[PDB]
Amino acid sequence: AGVVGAAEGFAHGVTGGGSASPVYPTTTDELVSYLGDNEPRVIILDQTFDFTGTEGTETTTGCAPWGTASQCQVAINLHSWCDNYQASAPKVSVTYDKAGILPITVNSNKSIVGQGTKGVIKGKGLRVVSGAKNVIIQNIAVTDINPKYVWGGDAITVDDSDLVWIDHVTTARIGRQHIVLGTSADNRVTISYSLIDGRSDYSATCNGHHYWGVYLDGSNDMVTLKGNYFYNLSGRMPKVQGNTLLHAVNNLFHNFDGHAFEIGTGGYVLAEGNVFQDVNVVVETPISGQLFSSPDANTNQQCASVFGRSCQLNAFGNSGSMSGSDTSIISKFAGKTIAAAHPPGAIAQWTMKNAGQGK
């Protein structure tokens, strides 16, 4: 088989492995090999690649800054994090699965595609770093990477890249970030129709909601976030800063016992057509970055001169409010491939049945 469809938005010209004849890895070693080699490849995953326990376990130092109850996460003291950022927190002993620490390195020009509902990677994530570019990650699930431990593993990492398309992916039960960009330039990136499942037995907010969602911290980034289902999170969903232009369109934010957006200095967000259902705090205020939340039909017409269409309203149901009208963000899209936006009315229904792996 192969890639289905084309990237919308900023990463529209992504080709990945192109027309290379599809390879079907049979083991975790072959998967790692194909992902890191210097040849363009179209890698088809038709089975579960479980890295859990392949590197054994290690007992090390950590801290418990959010409580000692089983429902809470604890953190590994990676690169002195507990000493520098949580000095007053109790020091604890932690036994983690070693495979989650270092993600699999993904080189340039690759198309990683899952077949049906079988493409699953467990215990170790993926990282597109050091100048690797032109990568397509579609229809796969990356789950179970040291859920109880912060710094025990990130699912998808992008740092120093360009042209990355994450589509129809499902991330769940991860120790720290599901998706993390930066601090180097990531340029054109499109994350679409994916499911960020925040339900976990261990949470930094001790409430079954994941706190480390999507962190956009790149230094020259243009990210299109479209048609995703952000479910059951409590923070960093998404946390935007650095020098990132984020186009958040038609995503469903659902069941957040905490907050969604964290817009810091260098974060420019254009949010339209999203649906917020049962999200306590939509945006943490005060905002240090800039925001155009398509606040009303009249102000939305301002998008017309550069977009060629008006911006779409966001819908709120049993949620906090949001209102930003920084029109200076609209002009940053001039000449760029801008993803289409549908009214918020049918978004929730469709997103639930179409977002994620296997859909």
CSV table of C-alpha atoms in Angstrom, one decimal:
chain,number,residue,atom,x,y,z
A,1,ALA,CA,0.0,0.0,0.0
A,2,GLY,CA,1.3,3.5,0.8
A,3,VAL,CA,0.4,7.1,1.8
A,4,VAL,CA,-3.2,8.2,1.3
A,5,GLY,CA,-4.0,11.8,0.5
A,6,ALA,CA,-1.8,14.9,0.7
A,7,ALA,CA,-0.8,17.2,3.4
A,8,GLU,CA,-2.9,20.3,3.9
A,9,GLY,CA,-1.5,23.6,5.0
A,10,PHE,CA,2.2,24.4,5.7
A,11,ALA,CA,3.7,21.0,4.8
A,12,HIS,CA,1.7,20.6,1.6
A,13,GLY,CA,4.7,19.8,-0.6
A,14,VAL,CA,5.9,16.8,1.5
A,15,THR,CA,6.7,13.6,-0.5
A,16,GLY,CA,8.3,11.4,2.2
A,17,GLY,CA,9.7,8.3,0.6
A,18,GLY,CA,8.1,9.1,-2.7
A,19,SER,CA,7.5,6.2,-5.0
A,20,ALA,CA,10.0,3.8,-3.4
A,21,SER,CA,8.9,0.2,-3.4
A,22,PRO,CA,7.3,-0.5,0.0
A,23,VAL,CA,9.3,-2.4,2.6
A,24,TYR,CA,7.7,-4.5,5.3
A,25,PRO,CA,9.9,-4.8,8.4
A,26,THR,CA,9.4,-8.1,10.4
A,27,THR,CA,11.3,-7.2,13.5
A,28,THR,CA,12.1,-4.2,15.7
A,29,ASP,CA,15.7,-4.3,14.4
A,30,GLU,CA,14.6,-4.0,10.8
A,31,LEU,CA,12.2,-1.2,11.7
A,32,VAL,CA,15.0,0.8,13.3
A,33,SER,CA,17.3,0.1,10.3
A,34,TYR,CA,14.9,1.2,7.6
A,35,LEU,CA,14.0,4.4,9.6
A,36,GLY,CA,17.5,5.5,10.0
A,37,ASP,CA,19.2,4.5,6.7
A,38,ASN,CA,20.2,7.0,4.0
A,39,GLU,CA,17.8,5.7,1.3
A,40,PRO,CA,14.3,7.0,0.6
A,41,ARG,CA,11.8,4.5,1.9
A,42,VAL,CA,8.1,3.7,2.2
A,43,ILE,CA,7.9,1.6,5.4
A,44,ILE,CA,4.6,-0.3,5.9
A,45,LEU,CA,3.8,-1.4,9.5
A,46,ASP,CA,1.4,-4.4,9.5
A,47,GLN,CA,2.1,-5.5,13.1
A,48,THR,CA,2.9,-4.3,16.6
A,49,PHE,CA,6.6,-3.5,17.1
A,50,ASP,CA,6.9,-3.7,20.9
A,51,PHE,CA,10.1,-2.3,22.3
A,52,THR,CA,9.0,-2.8,25.9
A,53,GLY,CA,11.6,-4.7,27.9
A,54,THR,CA,14.0,-5.0,25.0
A,55,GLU,CA,16.6,-2.9,26.9
A,56,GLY,CA,15.6,-4.1,30.3
A,57,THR,CA,14.9,-1.8,33.3
A,58,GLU,CA,17.0,0.5,35.5
A,59,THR,CA,16.5,1.9,39.0
A,60,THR,CA,17.4,5.6,39.4
A,61,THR,CA,16.7,8.8,41.3
A,62,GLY,CA,13.6,10.8,40.8
A,63,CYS,CA,11.2,13.2,42.6
A,64,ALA,CA,7.5,13.4,43.4
A,65,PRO,CA,6.4,17.1,42.9
A,66,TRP,CA,2.7,16.3,42.4
A,67,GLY,CA,2.0,14.0,45.4
A,68,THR,CA,2.7,10.4,46.3
A,69,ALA,CA,-0.7,8.8,45.5
A,70,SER,CA,-0.7,6.1,42.8
A,71,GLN,CA,-2.8,8.2,40.5
A,72,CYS,CA,0.0,10.7,40.3
A,73,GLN,CA,3.1,10.7,38.0
A,74,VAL,CA,6.6,11.0,39.4
A,75,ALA,CA,9.6,12.2,37.5
A,76,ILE,CA,13.0,10.8,36.7
A,77,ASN,CA,15.8,13.3,37.6
A,78,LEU,CA,16.9,13.6,34.0
A,79,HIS,CA,19.8,16.1,33.5
A,80,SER,CA,19.2,17.5,37.0
A,81,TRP,CA,15.5,18.4,36.5
A,82,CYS,CA,14.4,17.6,40.0
A,83,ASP,CA,17.4,19.6,41.5
A,84,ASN,CA,16.9,22.6,39.3
A,85,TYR,CA,13.2,22.9,38.9
A,86,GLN,CA,11.6,21.0,41.8
A,87,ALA,CA,14.1,21.5,44.7
A,88,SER,CA,11.5,21.3,47.4
A,89,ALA,CA,9.9,18.0,46.1
A,90,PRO,CA,10.5,14.7,47.8
A,91,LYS,CA,13.2,12.5,46.3
A,92,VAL,CA,12.0,9.0,45.3
A,93,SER,CA,13.4,5.8,43.7
A,94,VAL,CA,12.1,4.9,40.2
A,95,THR,CA,12.4,1.8,38.1
A,96,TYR,CA,11.7,2.6,34.5
A,97,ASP,CA,11.8,0.7,31.2
A,98,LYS,CA,15.1,1.8,29.5
A,99,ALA,CA,13.8,1.6,25.9
A,100,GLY,CA,11.7,4.7,26.3
A,101,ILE,CA,14.6,7.1,26.9
A,102,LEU,CA,16.1,7.4,23.4
A,103,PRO,CA,13.6,7.5,20.5
A,104,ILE,CA,14.3,5.8,17.2
A,105,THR,CA,16.1,8.2,14.8
A,106,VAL,CA,14.2,8.9,11.6
A,107,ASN,CA,16.3,10.0,8.7
A,108,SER,CA,15.2,12.1,5.6
A,109,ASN,CA,12.7,11.1,3.0
A,110,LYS,CA,10.6,8.5,4.7
A,111,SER,CA,7.0,7.5,4.6
A,112,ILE,CA,6.0,5.5,7.7
A,113,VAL,CA,2.5,4.0,7.1
A,114,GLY,CA,0.4,1.7,9.2
A,115,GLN,CA,-1.8,-0.9,7.5
A,116,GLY,CA,-5.4,-0.8,8.8
A,117,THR,CA,-5.5,-0.9,12.5
A,118,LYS,CA,-2.3,-3.1,12.9
A,119,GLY,CA,0.5,-0.5,12.7
A,120,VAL,CA,1.6,0.0,16.3
A,121,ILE,CA,4.8,1.0,18.0
A,122,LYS,CA,5.1,0.5,21.8
A,123,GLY,CA,7.7,1.4,24.3
A,124,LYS,CA,9.9,3.7,22.2
A,125,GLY,CA,9.1,6.8,20.3
A,126,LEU,CA,10.2,8.4,17.0
A,127,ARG,CA,12.5,11.5,16.5
A,128,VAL,CA,13.1,13.5,13.4
A,129,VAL,CA,16.2,15.5,14.3
A,130,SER,CA,19.5,16.9,13.2
A,131,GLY,CA,18.4,18.3,9.8
A,132,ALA,CA,16.4,15.3,8.8
A,133,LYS,CA,13.5,16.4,6.6
A,134,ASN,CA,10.6,15.4,4.3
A,135,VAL,CA,9.0,12.8,6.5
A,136,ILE,CA,5.4,11.4,6.5
A,137,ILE,CA,4.1,9.5,9.5
A,138,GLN,CA,0.6,8.2,8.8
A,139,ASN,CA,-1.9,5.8,10.3
A,140,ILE,CA,0.2,4.4,13.2
A,141,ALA,CA,-0.2,4.3,17.0
A,142,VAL,CA,2.7,5.2,19.3
A,143,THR,CA,1.8,4.1,22.8
A,144,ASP,CA,2.9,2.8,26.2
A,145,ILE,CA,6.1,4.6,26.9
A,146,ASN,CA,6.8,4.7,30.7
A,147,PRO,CA,3.3,6.3,31.5
A,148,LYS,CA,4.1,6.8,35.2
A,149,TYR,CA,7.3,8.7,34.6
A,150,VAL,CA,7.9,12.3,33.4
A,151,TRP,CA,11.1,12.2,31.3
A,152,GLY,CA,10.5,8.5,30.8
A,153,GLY,CA,9.8,9.2,27.1
A,154,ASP,CA,8.3,11.4,24.4
A,155,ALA,CA,6.2,9.9,21.6
A,156,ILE,CA,7.0,12.1,18.6
A,157,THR,CA,9.9,14.5,18.6
A,158,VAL,CA,10.8,17.0,15.8
A,159,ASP,CA,13.9,19.2,16.3
A,160,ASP,CA,15.8,20.8,13.4
A,161,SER,CA,13.8,19.8,10.4
A,162,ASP,CA,11.3,20.8,7.6
A,163,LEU,CA,8.4,19.2,5.8
A,164,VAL,CA,7.0,16.8,8.4
A,165,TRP,CA,3.4,15.5,8.1
A,166,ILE,CA,1.9,13.6,11.1
A,167,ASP,CA,-1.5,12.2,10.0
A,168,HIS,CA,-4.0,9.8,11.4
A,169,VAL,CA,-1.7,9.0,14.3
A,170,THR,CA,-2.9,8.0,17.8
A,171,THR,CA,-0.7,8.6,20.8
A,172,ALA,CA,-1.5,7.3,24.3
A,173,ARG,CA,-0.1,6.4,27.7
A,174,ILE,CA,3.2,8.3,27.3
A,175,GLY,CA,5.4,9.5,30.2
A,176,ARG,CA,5.9,13.0,28.9
A,177,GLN,CA,5.1,14.8,25.6
A,178,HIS,CA,3.0,13.2,22.9
A,179,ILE,CA,4.4,15.6,20.4
A,180,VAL,CA,7.3,18.0,21.0
A,181,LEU,CA,8.9,20.5,18.5
A,182,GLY,CA,12.0,22.6,19.1
A,183,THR,CA,14.1,24.2,20.2
A,184,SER,CA,15.7,24.5,16.7
A,185,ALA,CA,13.8,25.5,13.6
A,186,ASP,CA,11.2,22.9,12.4
A,187,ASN,CA,9.9,25.0,9.6
A,188,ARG,CA,6.8,23.5,7.7
A,189,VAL,CA,4.8,21.0,9.8
A,190,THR,CA,1.3,19.7,9.5
A,191,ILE,CA,-0.3,17.6,12.3
A,192,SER,CA,-3.7,16.4,11.1
A,193,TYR,CA,-6.6,14.1,11.8
A,194,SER,CA,-4.8,12.6,14.8
A,195,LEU,CA,-6.0,11.5,18.2
A,196,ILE,CA,-4.1,12.6,21.3
A,197,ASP,CA,-5.6,10.3,23.9
A,198,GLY,CA,-4.8,11.8,27.3
A,199,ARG,CA,-6.5,9.1,29.4
A,200,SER,CA,-3.8,7.5,31.7
A,201,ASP,CA,-3.6,5.7,35.0
A,202,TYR,CA,-0.9,8.1,36.1
A,203,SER,CA,-1.2,11.9,35.7
A,204,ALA,CA,0.8,15.0,36.8
A,205,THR,CA,-2.6,16.5,37.8
A,206,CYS,CA,-3.5,13.2,39.6
A,207,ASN,CA,-6.9,13.1,37.7
A,208,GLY,CA,-6.5,10.6,34.9
A,209,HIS,CA,-5.8,13.5,32.4
A,210,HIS,CA,-2.4,13.9,30.6
A,211,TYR,CA,-0.6,17.2,31.2
A,212,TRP,CA,2.1,17.0,28.6
A,213,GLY,CA,0.3,17.2,25.3
A,214,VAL,CA,1.7,19.1,22.4
A,215,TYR,CA,4.6,21.5,22.9
A,216,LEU,CA,5.5,23.8,20.0
A,217,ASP,CA,8.8,25.4,21.0
A,218,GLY,CA,10.7,25.8,17.7
A,219,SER,CA,12.6,28.9,16.6
A,220,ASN,CA,11.2,29.3,13.1
A,221,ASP,CA,8.1,27.2,12.8
A,222,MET,CA,4.9,27.2,10.7
A,223,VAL,CA,2.5,24.6,12.0
A,224,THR,CA,-1.0,23.6,10.7
A,225,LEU,CA,-3.0,21.7,13.3
A,226,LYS,CA,-6.1,20.4,11.7
A,227,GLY,CA,-9.0,18.0,12.4
A,228,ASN,CA,-7.4,16.4,15.4
A,229,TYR,CA,-9.2,15.0,18.5
A,230,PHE,CA,-7.4,16.3,21.7
A,231,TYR,CA,-9.0,14.1,24.3
A,232,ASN,CA,-8.8,14.1,28.1
A,233,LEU,CA,-5.8,16.4,28.8
A,234,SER,CA,-5.1,18.9,31.6
A,235,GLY,CA,-2.4,21.1,30.1
A,236,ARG,CA,0.1,21.9,27.3
A,237,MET,CA,-2.6,21.4,24.7
A,238,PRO,CA,-1.0,23.1,23.0
A,239,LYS,CA,1.8,25.0,24.6
A,240,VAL,CA,3.1,27.5,22.0
A,241,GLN,CA,6.2,29.7,22.1
A,242,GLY,CA,9.6,30.3,20.5
A,243,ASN,CA,8.8,31.7,17.0
A,244,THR,CA,5.9,29.6,16.0
A,245,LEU,CA,3.0,30.5,13.7
A,246,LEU,CA,0.2,28.1,14.6
A,247,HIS,CA,-2.9,27.7,12.5
A,248,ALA,CA,-5.3,25.7,14.8
A,249,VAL,CA,-8.3,24.7,12.6
A,250,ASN,CA,-11.3,22.4,13.1
A,251,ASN,CA,-9.9,20.5,16.1
A,252,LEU,CA,-12.1,19.0,18.9
A,253,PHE,CA,-10.8,19.7,22.4
A,254,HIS,CA,-12.8,17.5,24.8
A,255,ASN,CA,-13.0,16.8,28.5
A,256,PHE,CA,-10.1,18.9,29.9
A,257,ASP,CA,-10.1,19.1,33.7
A,258,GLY,CA,-7.4,21.8,33.5
A,259,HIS,CA,-6.4,23.9,30.5
A,260,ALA,CA,-5.7,23.8,26.8
A,261,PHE,CA,-3.7,26.7,25.3
A,262,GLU,CA,-0.5,28.2,26.8
A,263,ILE,CA,0.6,31.0,24.5
A,264,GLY,CA,4.0,32.3,25.4
A,265,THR,CA,6.3,34.9,23.9
A,266,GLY,CA,6.9,34.1,20.3
A,267,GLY,CA,3.7,32.2,19.9
A,268,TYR,CA,1.3,33.5,17.2
A,269,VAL,CA,-2.0,31.6,17.1
A,270,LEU,CA,-4.8,31.8,14.6
A,271,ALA,CA,-7.6,29.7,15.9
A,272,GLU,CA,-10.8,29.1,13.9
A,273,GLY,CA,-13.5,26.5,13.6
A,274,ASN,CA,-12.5,24.5,16.7
A,275,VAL,CA,-15.0,23.0,19.1
A,276,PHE,CA,-14.3,23.1,22.9
A,277,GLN,CA,-16.4,20.7,24.8
A,278,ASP,CA,-16.0,20.4,28.6
A,279,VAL,CA,-12.7,22.3,28.6
A,280,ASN,CA,-12.4,24.2,31.9
A,281,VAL,CA,-9.8,26.8,30.8
A,282,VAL,CA,-9.5,27.3,27.1
A,283,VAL,CA,-6.5,29.6,27.3
A,284,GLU,CA,-4.3,30.4,30.3
A,285,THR,CA,-4.4,34.2,30.9
A,286,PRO,CA,-2.5,36.5,30.7
A,287,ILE,CA,-1.2,35.5,27.3
A,288,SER,CA,2.4,36.5,26.5
A,289,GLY,CA,2.1,35.7,22.8
A,290,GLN,CA,-0.4,36.8,20.2
A,291,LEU,CA,-3.9,35.5,19.4
A,292,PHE,CA,-6.6,35.8,16.8
A,293,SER,CA,-9.4,33.6,17.9
A,294,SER,CA,-11.9,34.5,15.2
A,295,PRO,CA,-14.1,36.1,17.9
A,296,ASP,CA,-17.2,37.2,15.8
A,297,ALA,CA,-18.6,37.2,12.2
A,298,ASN,CA,-17.6,40.8,11.6
A,299,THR,CA,-14.0,40.6,12.8
A,300,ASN,CA,-13.7,37.3,10.9
A,301,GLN,CA,-14.2,39.1,7.6
A,302,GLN,CA,-10.8,40.6,8.1
A,303,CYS,CA,-9.3,37.3,7.0
A,304,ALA,CA,-10.8,37.6,3.5
A,305,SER,CA,-8.1,39.9,2.0
A,306,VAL,CA,-5.3,37.4,2.5
A,307,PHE,CA,-7.1,34.1,3.0
A,308,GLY,CA,-9.6,34.6,0.2
A,309,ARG,CA,-12.3,33.6,2.7
A,310,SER,CA,-13.5,34.6,6.1
A,311,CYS,CA,-12.3,32.9,9.3
A,312,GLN,CA,-14.7,30.5,11.0
A,313,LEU,CA,-16.0,30.9,14.5
A,314,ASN,CA,-15.0,28.5,17.3
A,315,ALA,CA,-17.8,26.7,19.3
A,316,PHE,CA,-17.8,26.3,23.1
A,317,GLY,CA,-19.9,23.9,25.1
A,318,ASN,CA,-19.7,23.8,28.9
A,319,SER,CA,-16.3,25.5,28.6
A,320,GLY,CA,-14.2,28.5,29.5
A,321,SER,CA,-14.1,31.5,27.1
A,322,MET,CA,-11.5,32.8,24.6
A,323,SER,CA,-11.2,36.1,22.8
A,324,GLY,CA,-8.2,37.5,20.9
A,325,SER,CA,-8.4,39.8,17.9
A,326,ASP,CA,-4.8,40.5,16.9
A,327,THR,CA,-5.3,40.9,13.2
A,328,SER,CA,-1.5,41.3,12.7
A,329,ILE,CA,-1.4,37.5,12.7
A,330,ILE,CA,-3.6,37.3,9.6
A,331,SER,CA,-0.9,39.0,7.4
A,332,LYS,CA,1.7,36.3,8.3
A,333,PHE,CA,-0.3,33.9,6.1
A,334,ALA,CA,0.1,36.0,2.9
A,335,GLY,CA,1.1,33.7,0.0
A,336,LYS,CA,1.1,30.5,2.1
A,337,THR,CA,-0.9,27.3,1.4
A,338,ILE,CA,-3.7,27.8,4.0
A,339,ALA,CA,-5.8,24.8,5.1
A,340,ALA,CA,-9.6,25.0,4.4
A,341,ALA,CA,-11.8,25.6,7.4
A,342,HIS,CA,-15.4,24.3,7.9
A,343,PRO,CA,-17.9,25.8,10.3
A,344,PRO,CA,-17.8,24.4,13.8
A,345,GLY,CA,-21.3,22.8,13.7
A,346,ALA,CA,-20.5,19.4,12.4
A,347,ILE,CA,-16.8,19.2,13.6
A,348,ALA,CA,-17.4,17.3,16.9
A,349,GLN,CA,-19.3,14.5,15.3
A,350,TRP,CA,-17.0,14.0,12.3
A,351,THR,CA,-13.7,14.3,14.3
A,352,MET,CA,-14.7,11.5,16.8
A,353,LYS,CA,-15.2,9.1,13.9
A,354,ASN,CA,-12.4,10.2,11.6
A,355,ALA,CA,-9.4,11.1,13.8
A,356,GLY,CA,-6.6,8.7,14.8
A,357,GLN,CA,-5.1,5.4,13.6
A,358,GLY,CA,-7.5,2.9,12.1
A,359,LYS,CA,-10.0,5.5,10.9
